[PDB]
Structure 1
Amino acid sequence: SGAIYVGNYRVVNRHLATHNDWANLVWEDSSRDLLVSSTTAQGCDTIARCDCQTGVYYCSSRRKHYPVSFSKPSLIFVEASEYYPARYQSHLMLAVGHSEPGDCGGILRCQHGVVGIVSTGGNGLVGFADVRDLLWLDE
């Protein structure tokens, strides 16, 4: 689990969105596994605006943060799960690192701020849904 809180927005994995997230929907994209809902409280996270390929992510299944090198956002084939059939997920970045399904939502950060959230994984890889291109999260 995990979310990004910026301004009057809450960014979560679309497959983990709650009833309140859907009742206050701002934007969702199944191909990216992202959903953004509105909040009454003001969020303080900073979103990165950059093309970094190194950062640190939080891994809840180890209670640890790990430093990683990751690929630029791209269209990657993702195996079926209980939430989606096998499909291409867009805006996805991969790294070599540990992840389990419950790790989804953990933040990946660089020196500029929040880069994205854990969304995919398996076989010693971890994939992150990018949020750096969502310029509207700031205004």
Structure 2
Amino acid sequence: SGAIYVGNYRVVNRHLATHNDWANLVWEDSSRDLLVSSTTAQGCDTIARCDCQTGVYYCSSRRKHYPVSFSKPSLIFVEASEYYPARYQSHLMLAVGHSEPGDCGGILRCQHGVVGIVSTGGNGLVGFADVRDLLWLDEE
């Protein structure tokens, strides 16, 4: 589990969104596994606006933050899980790191701020849903 809290937005994995998230929906995209809802309080996270390929992510199944090198956001085939059939997921970055399903939501960050959240993984791989192209998260 986990979310990004920027401005009056809460960014979560679409497959982990609650009824309150769907009832206060701003935007959602199943192909990216992302959903954004509105918040009453302002958050403290800042979004990275960059092309970094190195950063650090949080792994809840290890209580640890790991430094990783990660690929550029791309369209990648992801195997079936409890939440999606086997399919192509867009805007996804891969790194070598430990992941388990409840690890989704952990933040990946670089020197510029938050890059994205854990969304896929398995077999020593971890996938991140990128948020750096969602410029509207910085306003309104």
What TM-score bracket applies, with the shorter chain setting the length? over 0.9
Post-superposition offset of 1:69: 0.2
The Cα RMSD (Å) is 0.5
The runs of 5 or more residues in structure 1 that have no matched partner are none
The residue that corresponds to 2:50 in the other structure is: 50
Does residue 71 (structure 1) correspond to residue 71 (structure 2)? The answer is: yes
Residue equivalent to 1:14: 14
TM superposition shift of 1:17 = 0.1
Secondary structure of 1:137's aligned partner:
helix
Offset from partner CA, 1:6-65 (integer Å, 9 cap, x none): 001000000000000000000000000000000010111000000000000000000000
**Residue 85 of structure 1, CA deviation:** 1.0
Aligned residue for 2:39, secondary structure, equals strand
Rounded to whole Å, the distance in 1 between the matches of 2:61 and 2:85 is 25
Q: Determine the C-alpha separation between the residues in 2 that align with 1:82 and 1:111.
A: 33
Q: Please give the per-residue CA displacement for 1:63-109, whole angstroms capped at 9, x wherever unaligned.
A: 00000000000000011112111110000000001010010000000
- Point out where structure 2 has 5 or more consecutive residues left out of the alignment: none
Q: Share of identical aligned residues, percent? A: 100
Show structure 1 runs of 4+ deviating over 6 A: none
Aligned residues: 139
Alpha-carbon separation, structure 1, partners of 2:79 and 2:107: 22
Q: Which residue of 1 aligns with 2:4?
A: 4
- TM (normalized to structure 2)? 0.98
Normalising by structure 1, what TM-score? 0.99
Structure 2 equivalent of residue 24 of structure 1: 24
